[PDB]
């Protein structure tokens, strides 16, 4: 608050009273009177350099450089040297990149959507989630950040017919379109090598 620490009429007693010449609360009979105020070292005062709303929050990024890292993050979904080092459990799968049929995009139910991910080798990576759900160490728990879990597969489609809703409730699994290809999901934590499952329609549209 801009008025925090300045809601009093404290005035300095000056020198000659064997006390610090920092302004003190006037009046009497309450205990608060005679106490220091208006200082960063005083109890109940304002802090040094109060935080302002006009601090820079969003950072401008060049559009070509933004696409440069996104293309580098798609190329990070190449050979599993980066993918294994990124924490994903992709040792017992056929190959990278994984290209599946378009029939994922028309799947409506979560149960059949989940079973399709188990068949293509993502069984191990899904159990990395639902077993790493740990309570947060910091104070953010009562700041709506109570739980923390690992990151699962990224399913990429060309046109949505129900795959987004089917995989919405599956923990750790994010769905994205070839049009967007968010860098926040392709390299989360500034770590390259996200495990990404492509559909056949999405893979050809990627070109």
């Amino acid at each position: 608050s801009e008025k925090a620490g300045h809601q009093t009429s404290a005035e300095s007693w000056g020198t000659g009273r064997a006390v610090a010449r920092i302004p003190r609360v006037g009046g009497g009979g309450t205990g608060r009177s005679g106490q220091g105020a208006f200082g960063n070292m005083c109890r109940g005062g304002r802090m040094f350099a109060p935080t302002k709303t006009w601090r820079k929050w969003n950072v401008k990024v060049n559009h070509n450089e933004k696409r440069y890292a996104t293309a580098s993050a798609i190329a990070a979904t190449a050979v599993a040297s980066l993918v294994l080092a990124r924490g994903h459990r992709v040792e017992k799968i056929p190959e990278i990149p994984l290209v599946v049929s378009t029939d994922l995009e028309s799947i409506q139910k979560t149960k059949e959507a989940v079973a399709a991910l188990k068949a293509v080798g993502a069984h191990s990576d899904l159990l990395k989630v639902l077993k790493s759900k740990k309570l947060r160490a910091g104070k953010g728990k009562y700041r709506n950040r109570r739980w923390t879990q690992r990151r699962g597969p990224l399913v990429v489609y060309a046109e949505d017919n129900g795959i987004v809703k089917a995989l919405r409730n599956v923990p750790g699994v994010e769905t994205a379109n070839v049009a967007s290809l968010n860098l926040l999901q392709l390299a989360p934590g500034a770590h390259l090598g996200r495990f990404v499952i492509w559909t056949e329609a999405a893979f050809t549209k990627l070109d």
Partner: peptide
Amino acid sequence: PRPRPRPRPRPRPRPRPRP
């Protein structure tokens, strides 16, 4: 518990003569 006593500074030593 009564209110805190008001601060009560000292009688400020007797003034020397000023030329």
